[PDB]
C-alpha cells in the first residue's frame, strides 16, 4: 500500500483546472520516517508514542507543479517540492517503521520485545488492529437462482476497474420464469431495467445475426436460440441505434425531456458506467458487446441446466481485504475531499483576480485527522455518514496472552449482518481446508462469521497483469477483436482477472507453459493462479489481491520433486544461504489458491498414498506438507486434538485467549490497562510440533499440575 | 406577461446576484448568446431565492449559467402564482434608542445630543464592561476609581474619562454612534429605564 497504492492514487486523480486559470498537478510523493516536534523534528520510538498517547504517524510530502496560463502566453511552471499533506500512521515493524531489521539487542535497548510480531498501528497511544474483511469477488459472472422473486435465474456481475473513485457497478441479467423467458438487464445508475436486445442495439449492432453470434457460438442445437427467441421478439419495434438510445435514456436518473438529452445520457451511462473493468475508454464496444454476450450465454447455459449454479460460500469466489485495500479505500475519498477543498478555495480567491498561495490552500487537517479518526473508532468511512458503512473494522489489540495477540492479528470477518435468520454463511464450507482453522470461532452471536487464518495460509498482495498479457499475446493467443465468431465454438476462452480477452486453440501446451513459467518465477509470479475448465473450454488467470492460498509439494508422476538434496541443503541453513524462497525458486513447492485447488489431486502423505497398492488414483499432482497445518494458532496448541469432540476443540480455541500468562516480555514498561501475569508459567510437558513456531515455549500460559480424576 | 420563477441563491449575497446578472446581460447582448431573461427581482426580506421574470424555464436555465450564486437554482425552479406578482411589489413598513452591532446589541441608550451633521448621534449608555479584569457583562454603574486603579488604556479629565475601545465616559458613557446602527422608532422604555436614565 505505502509503496505503490498512494502514488497510484495521487497520479490517477484527474488534473484540477478551472480570468485565467492554473494547472496544479501532483506527482512524486515523498514519505519520511515518523518524527515528533516550539520544537524541531526528531524521531519517536513506538514505546514513547505508546506511553505519551501520541500517534505513530509520518508526514507525507508531494511534488506540485503550478502553471498559470493567460492571454499572451505568460505561463510559469513553478514547482513546489515536498509540500506537506498530512500524517499517515505506520504499521509497526513495516518497511517505514523505525523498528525495521534491527537486531534483538537494539529492540531490548529500546524497551521493545523482540517477540512482538508487530502488524498493528498506534493511534492516541492505543494499539489498533485491522480485521481482514471478506467480500464477493469482483469482475466475475455469478449465476444464482432465487425462488423469492420473479427471476428464474440471474447472472450478477460486480465490477470495478482499478481502485477508482466511482463505486463498483453491478450488472444483472435476469430471466423471467412465467412465450416466456423474458431476458432483461438491470443497468446500474438507471432506475428501471431494460431488455438485453435493446442494449445490444444501443451498442450499435443492428444486425440480428451479429447479436446472436455474440450470444450463441453454436448453430446446430437450437435450445439457446429457442429460449432467446421470445426475448428477440419483445424488442421488435427497435431497430436503429438512436431510438434504442432514446428508449434507454427515457429511464435514466435525469430523464431529459428532449430526445437529444436522452441520447446523450444513455450514451454516457453506457460508455462510462456499464462494465468499467473491460474498459471505459473512447470506445470499447467491440469487447463490451462480447462480454455482455458471454454473460447472456452463461445465463442461458444455467437455464438449460448444462452448467450448475455458482456457490456464494465457495471461497474461490471470495476476496479478503487487508489493511492495504482498506487504507486505499479511505485515501481515495480523503484525497478527493482535499482536492475539493483546494478547488473551492481557488474559486473563492480567483474571483477577485488575486493570486493565491497554495501553501495556505492545502489543509493538513483533512488527511491526518480523518484517517486517525477512522482508524481509531473503527467506523470505516466518512465521519459525517459513518453509520452508512461498516463498523468494527479497527479493533483494540488484545494483549492478554501471547496466543490471544497472535490470534487477533490473523482474523477474518464476514460482513454478513448479525441477528440474521440465515445459517448458510455460518456453516463450515468444504473449501475452507488449509485456508481457515476449522475449530477457532466465537461462540456468541457471531458464530461462524469470524474466522482465523490457518498456519501456512497466505494472502495474495496482487500484481500487475500486463506482463502476462504480453507473454500470452506473443504466443498463439488471438485477440478478441480479430477472430471470426465461428471459431469461438471450437476453441477455449481466455479470461484475465475476469476480463474476457482473446482465444486459443491448444490449451494443454498453454497450461504447461504457464505452469513452467510460474515454477521458474521468471514472468509469472508465484501469486498468479491459473485454472482450466474441461467441460467448458475456459481458462481463467487471476492476479488480483485478496486471494487466499497455501503452499503445496509438487508431484510429477508418483514421486515428489523434493529429495534428500533439498532436505540436506535446508538442514544446514543459516550457515549457507539456502532458505524457503530458494526452495520455491527450485520449483519444488507451489502456492495453490482455493480456486485452483478445485482442479488438482492431493495426496495426504507421500509414503502412504503414493506407493503401489490397489489402484485408487495413481495420478496425484500435489502432496500436503503436513496435515496438521489446517489448524489455526489457538487450535494448534491442543495435544491430540483428533481424539476430542469438535465442540470441545472450539471451546479450547476460545478459552486459550483468556489464559493467564506472560503476554509479553517487557510488561514492566507498558502502562496497559487490565494486565494479568502469572508468577510461574511452565512449558507444557506434552506439546505439539506446531506450537514450536508460536513461541509458546518462550511465553507459556499455564502450569503442569498433578491432576487426579476422582 | 412573461412568467416569474424562483431561483435558489446563496443567503446573504442576494443583492450582488442581481447586479451580476445585469452585468452579464450588458456584456452579452451584442454577443452570439444574449440573455433572453426579462428581469431579476430581489426582495428586501425574502432570503434564499431570487425572482426571475422570463418567458420559459429554459430561458432561465440558459441565462443563469456560470453564476456561482445561482448554482442551487440552476437545475430546478418552482411555479410562482400569477396572482402573487402584485404582492411581489408590495413592501410593508431627547429620545431613546438601542444599538444594533457591537457588544451593546439591544441595549438602552438615551439620545443626549443630536449632531446636525446627520452622521453620528451622541448617546448615553450604562457600561457593559469588566474594567479590563478578566478579559485580556451586565449593566452596572460606571466605577471610575476601579478603572483608574487597574490602569491600562485610560485617560482622565476629572469627571471625564477615555478608556479602552475609544470609549468616552462622563460621571455613564457618552459616545457617538450612527443612526444606522441604532433604532429610532419602537424602543418605548419603561419606568425602570426612566429611573436608570388603559
Amino acid at each position: 500500500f505505502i509503496q505503490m497504492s498512494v502514488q497510484r492514487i495521487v497520479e490517477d486523480a484527474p488534473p484540477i483546472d478551472l480570468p485565467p486559470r492554473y494547472l496544479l498537478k501532483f506527482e512524486q510523493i515523498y514519505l519520511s520516517k515518523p518524527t515528533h516536534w516550539d520544537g524541531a523534528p526528531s524521531p519517536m520510538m513506538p514505546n514513547e508514542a505508546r506511553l505519551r498517547n501520541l500517534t505513530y504517524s509520518a508526514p507525507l510530502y508531494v511534488d506540485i507543479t503550478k502553471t498559470v496560463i493567460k492571454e499572451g502566453e505568460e505561463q510559469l511552471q513553478t514547482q513546489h517540492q515536498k509540500t506537506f499533506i498530512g500524517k499517515i500512521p505506520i504499521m509497526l515493524r513495516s518497511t517505514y517503521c523505525l523498528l525495521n531489521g534491527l537486531t534483538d539487542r537494539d529492540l531490548c535497548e529500546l524497551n521493545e520485545c523482540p517477540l512482538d510480531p508487530g502488524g498493528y498501528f498506534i493511534i492516541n497511544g492505543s494499539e489498533k488492529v485491522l480485521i481482514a474483511q471478506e467480500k464477493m469477488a469482483t469482475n466475475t459472472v455469478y449465476v444464482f437462482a432465487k425462488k423469492d422473486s420473479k427471476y428464474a435465474y440471474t447472472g450478477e456481475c460486480r465490477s470495478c476497474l482499478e481502485n477508482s473513485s466511482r463505486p463498483t457497478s453491478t450488472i444483472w441479467v435476469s430471466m423471467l420464469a412465467r412465450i416466456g423467458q423474458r431476458i432483461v438487464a438491470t443497468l446500474p445508475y438507471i432506475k428501471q431495467e431494460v431488455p438485453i436486445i435493446i442494449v445490444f442495439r444501443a451498442l450499435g449492432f443492428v444486425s440480428d445475426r451479429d447479436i446472436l453470434e455474440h450470444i450463441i457460438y453454436d448453430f446446430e442445437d437450437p435450445e439457446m436460440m429457442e429460449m432467446v427467441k421470445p426475448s428477440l421478439d419483445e424488442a421488435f419495434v427497435i431497430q436503429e441505434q438512436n431510438v434504442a438510445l432514446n428508449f434507454i435514456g427515457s429511464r435514466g436518473a435525469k430523464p431529459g425531456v428532449t430526445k437529444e438529452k436522452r441520447i446523450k445520457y444513455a450514451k454516457e451511462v453506457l460508455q462510462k458506467e456499464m462494465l468499467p473493468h473491460v474498459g471505459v475508454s473512447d470506445f470499447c464496444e467491440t469487447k463490451k458487446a462480447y462480454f455482455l454476450g458471454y454473460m447472456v450465454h452463461r445465463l442461458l447455459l444455467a437455464a438449460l441446466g448444462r452448467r450448475e449454479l455458482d456457490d456464494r460460500d465457495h471461497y474461490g469466489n471470495k476476496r479478503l481485504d487487508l489493511a492495504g485495500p482498506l487504507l486505499a479505500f479511505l485515501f481515495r475519498g480523503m484525497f478527493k475531499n482535499l482536492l475539493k477543498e483546494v478547488r473551492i478555495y481557488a474559486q473563492k480567491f480567483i474571483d477577485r483576480g488575486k493570486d493565491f498561495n497554495l501553501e495556505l490552500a492545502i489543509k493538513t487537517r483533512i488527511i491526518s485527522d480523518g484517517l486517525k479518526y477512522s482508524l481509531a473508532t473503527g467506523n470505516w468511512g466518512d465521519q459525517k455518514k459513518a453509520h452508512q458503512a461498516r463498523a468494527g473494522v479497527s479493533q483494540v489489540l488484545n494483549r492478554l496472552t501471547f496466543a490471544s495477540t497472535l490470534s487477533h492479528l490473523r482474523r477474518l470477518n464476514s460482513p454478513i449482518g448479525r441477528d440474521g435468520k440465515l445459517a448458510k454463511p455460518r456453516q463450515l464450507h468444504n473449501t475452507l481446508w488449509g485456508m481457515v482453522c476449522p475449530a477457532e470461532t466465537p461462540e456468541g452471536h457471531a458464530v461462524g462469521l469470524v474466522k482465523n487464518l490457518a498456519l501456512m495460509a497466505y494472502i495474495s498482495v496482487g500484481s500487475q497483469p500486463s506482463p502476462i498479457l504480453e507473454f500470452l499475446e506473443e504466443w498463439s493467443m488471438e485477440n478478441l477483436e480479430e477472430i471470426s465468431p465461428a471459431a469461438i465454438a471450437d476453441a477455449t476462452k481466455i479470461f484475465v482477472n475476469g476480463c474476457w480477452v482473446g482465444i486459443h486453440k491448444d490449451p494443454e501446451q498453454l497450461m504447461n507453459t504457464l505452469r513452467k513459467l510460474r515454477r521458474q518465477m521468471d514472468i509469472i509470479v508465484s501469486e498468479v493462479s491459473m485454472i482450466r475448465d474441461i467441460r467448458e473450454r475456459e481458462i481463467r488467470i487471476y492476479t488480483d489481491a485478496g486471494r487466499i492460498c497455501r503452499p503445496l509439494l509438487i508431484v510429477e508422476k508418483q514421486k515428489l520433486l523434493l529429495k534428500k538434496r533439498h532436505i540436506d541443503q535446508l538442514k544446514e541453513r543459516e550457515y549457507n544461504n539456502y532458505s524457503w524462497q530458494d526452495l520455491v525458486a527450485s520449483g519444488v513447492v507451489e502456492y495453490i489458491d482455493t480456486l485452483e485447488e478445485e482442479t488438482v489431486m492431493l495426496a495426504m502423505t507421500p509414503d502412504d498414498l503414493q506407493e503401489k497398492e490397489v489402484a485408487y488414483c495413481s495420478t496425484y499432482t500435489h502432496c500436503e506438507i503436513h496435515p496438521s497445518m489446517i489448524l489455526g494458532v489457538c487450535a494448534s496448541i491442543i495435544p491430540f486434538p483428533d481424539h476430542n469432540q469438535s465442540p470441545r476443540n472450539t471451546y479450547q480455541s476460545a478459552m486459550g485467549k483468556q489464559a493467564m500468562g506472560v503476554y509479553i516480555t517487557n510488561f514492566h514498561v507498558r502502562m496497559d490497562t487490565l494486565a494479568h501475569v502469572l508468577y510461574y508459567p511452565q512449558k507444557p510437558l506434552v506439546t505439539t510440533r506446531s506450537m514450536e513456531y508460536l513461541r509458546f515455549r518462550e511465553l507459556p500460559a499455564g502450569i503442569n499440575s498433578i491432576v487426579a480424576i476422582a | 406577461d412573461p412568467n416569474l420563477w424562483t431561483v435558489k441563491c446563496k443567503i446573504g449575497e442576494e443583492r450582488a446576484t442581481a447586479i451580476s446578472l445585469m452585468r452579464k446581460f450588458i456584456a452579452y447582448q451584442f454577443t452570439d448568446t444574449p440573455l433572453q431573461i426579462k428581469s431579476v427581482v430581489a426582495p428586501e426580506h425574502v432570503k434564499g431565492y431570487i425572482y426571475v421574470e422570463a418567458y420559459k424555464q429554459t430561458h432561465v436555465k440558459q441565462a443563469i449559467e456560470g453564476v456561482g450564486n445561482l448554482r442551487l437554482g440552476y437545475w430546478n425552479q418552482q411555479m410562482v402564482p400569477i396572482k402573487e406578482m402584485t404582492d411581489v411589489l408590495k413592501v410593508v413598513k431627547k429620545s431613546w434608542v438601542r444599538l444594533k452591532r457591537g457588544i451593546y446589541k439591544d441595549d438602552i441608550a438615551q439620545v443626549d445630543y443630536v449632531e446636525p451633521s446627520q452622521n453620528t448621534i451622541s448617546l448615553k449608555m450604562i457600561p457593559r464592561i469588566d474594567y479590563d479584569r478578566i478579559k485580556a457583562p451586565p449593566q452596572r454603574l460606571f466605577d471610575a476609581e476601579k478603572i483608574r486603579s487597574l490602569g491600562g488604556d485610560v485617560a482622565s479629565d476629572g469627571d471625564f474619562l477615555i478608556f479602552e475601545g475609544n470609549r468616552y465616559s462622563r460621571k455613564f458613557l457618552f459616545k457617538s454612534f450612527a443612526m444606522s446602527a441604532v433604532i429610532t422608532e419602537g424602543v418605548k422604555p419603561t419606568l425602570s429605564e426612566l429611573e436608570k436614565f388603559r
Binding site: - | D1, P2, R15, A16, A18, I19, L21, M22, R23, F25, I26, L35, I37, K38, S39, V40, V41, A42, P43, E44, E53, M85, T86, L89, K90, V91, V92, K93
Partner: protein, 116 residues
C-alpha cells in the same frame, strides 16, 4: 449600458422621479440617466442629496423594460434600463416639483410602500 450599474453597494440611493438605484458617487460623477435633461444631477453634491435619498427598499435588476409587467406596474416602462427600487419614501422639493410641472413632467411619488 454599464454606466447605469453601480460600482459598489455603499451609500446607494433611489431617484425620486425614476426609482433608479445608483451610488451617490456616481450620482455626482454621472447623474440620473433620465433626470439629467431636467435637473442636471452632474456637477454637484448637495443638490443630489436633496433630489435623492438613501432610504429605499428592494432592488430590481431590470434589463428588458419593453417586455415586462414590472415596468408597467412601477411606471418605469419608458425609462432607461437599470436597477430600480421597489418603494421609496420621500418627496421632491417644492421648487423642483414646480419646475418639473412647468417643464411638462408630472411628479408622481414612488411610495408604493404600505403605511400600516
Amino acid at each position: 449600458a454599464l454606466e447605469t450599474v453601480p460600482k459598489d453597494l455603499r451609500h446607494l440611493r433611489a431617484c425620486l422621479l425614476c426609482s433608479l438605484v445608483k451610488t451617490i458617487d456616481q450620482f455626482e460623477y454621472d447623474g440620473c440617466d433620465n433626470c439629467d435633461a431636467y435637473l442636471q444631477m452632474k456637477g454637484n453634491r448637495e443638490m443630489v442629496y436633496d433630489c435623492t435619498s438613501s432610504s429605499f427598499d428592494g432592488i430590481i435588476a431590470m434589463m428588458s423594460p419593453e417586455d415586462s409587467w414590472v415596468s408597467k406596474w412601477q411606471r418605469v416602462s419608458n425609462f432607461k434600463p437599470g436597477v430600480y427600487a421597489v418603494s421609496v419614501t420621500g418627496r421632491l422639493p417644492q421648487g423642483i416639483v414646480r419646475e418639473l410641472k412647468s417643464r411638462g413632467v408630472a411628479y408622481k411619488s414612488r411610495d408604493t410602500a404600505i403605511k400600516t
